[model samples]
Target: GSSGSSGCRLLWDYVYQLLSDSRYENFIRWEDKESKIFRIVDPNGLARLWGNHKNRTNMTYEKMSRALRHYYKLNIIRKEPGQRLLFRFMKTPDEIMSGRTDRLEHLESQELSGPSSG
Candidate 1:
């Protein structure tokens, strides 16, 4: 018999609890399943500080570029010479899953846009 596997329910529960806290509300819904691909928003600028380039994969480059174009078209992001690259908040698992999805290319375009942010 095949055994069932534990999923990310625990992590999801933690996220949900975190979101329930008023202090985290403003940060909770910043990213969704779709908008979480490509870039990541780190208010603390951890990526810049820690030099965590582990997330820098081939797919990352591909997705980030696509996401940039999408954001530009929607005006959610604009190019600024010498400025930091555009970033979007993403749950770790979701980012990896996105890379594995069969619709990777389609998702790159279709799921890229949402409400604009300045």
Candidate 2:
């Protein structure tokens, strides 16, 4: 094996990167930013892109979902109740404050922009 492969990777990181990138919003985006709920608008396409990044040509939604299920155990993500292809990101409040300032501000702006002027 070669030693030139990229550093270790996590599926969640990839998913976050994609979500942060506006280009991929059509395929996956936040359903509820404050609640951390997101919907996979195009699971097949999302899986393909992940596979492409992972160097797994045969990656499919079935296999990709298996990884997400493991994330459930890690508390990184959870299935949305009564919904198909919907999931939520899980991060305790303290962790959110410690390292998610960008996210915090993003949420803040949503509320700050709600004022109306005649």
Candidate 3:
């Protein structure tokens, strides 16, 4: 209700939706799932879909970006050298878990040697 980009509660809500929902796969997707990085391939298209979802005619990429900025401040989202509409979603872990996300990737050599390696 507060974000104003869509009926979606947060910018990330719609982004996560775009990530999981196959229909919008072309519009948005994981640049690096392991990195939790994603991108908006089409800004206007996203705003259009988001507008339709939110029932707001005022939706625009600029305002949508404003909504996105809020998330950056919250540590709910991140950006890694992305320009304009491109952004990377980050995570908090020792290393990036690849292929499958069940467990973390790998840690320092000491970590492999022992759990109390810290």
Candidate 4:
């Protein structure tokens, strides 16, 4: 479970700080028919500053995704017509934070299960 509101506030703070410094611009682009992705374009080295925070926090892709969604709901990011794609900011947080060995085990099991025949 995550705090959606807190995440939205934090994202707004980050975005506002970036814009205030004239460091980057935020954009919303459609990655698929069902999903929209938010991205920040750094023209004045703001990405580096934020990148440092992201790195220090060791945030996961899922956490980042949640945060982005929060921003989206706030009208900070909007959808645009375009090609569908998935943007992975960092490695899945599950693997990093929990170190769940079962994921690998499950993957191996799937591999052993073999392809299905029609």
Writing each residue's lDDT as its tens digit, candidate 4 over 6-111 gives 2212332354344334324443222232332334442224334433554434433333334445434534444343622233222222232222555322332232
Model 4 residue pairs with clashes: 31-84
Question: Residue-wise lDDT of candidate 2 within 21-49, one digit each (tens)?
Answer: 77889989988999877788998888888
For each candidate in the order shown, give its overall lDDT on alpha carbons: 0.36, 0.65, 0.59, 0.36
Name the regions of candidate 3 deviating beyond 4 angstroms. Answer: 1-8, 92-118
lDDT of 1 at 9: 22
Q: Which ten residues in a row have the lowest lDDT in candidate 4?
A: 104-113
Task: Please report how far candidate 2 places residue 69 from its true position, in Å.
Answer: 1.0
Error of 4 at 14 (Å): 0.8
**Model 3 local distance difference test score:** 0.59
lDDT of 3 by residue, 4-85 (tens): 4433144545677678777778788877777777789888788787666555676778767665565476565665653756
Is candidate 1 or 2 superior in lDDT?
2
Clash count of each predicted structure: 2, 0, 0, 1
Predicted structure with the largest lDDT when compared to the true one: 2
RMSD of each: 12.9, 15.6, 14.3, 13.9
Clashing pairs in 1: 40-88, 41-88
Candidate 4, superposed: residue stretches over 4 Å from native:
1-9, 23-39, 42-51, 54-56, 60-62, 74-76, 81-118
1 against 4, candidate with superior TM-score = 4
Per-residue lDDT, model 4, residue 64, is: 38
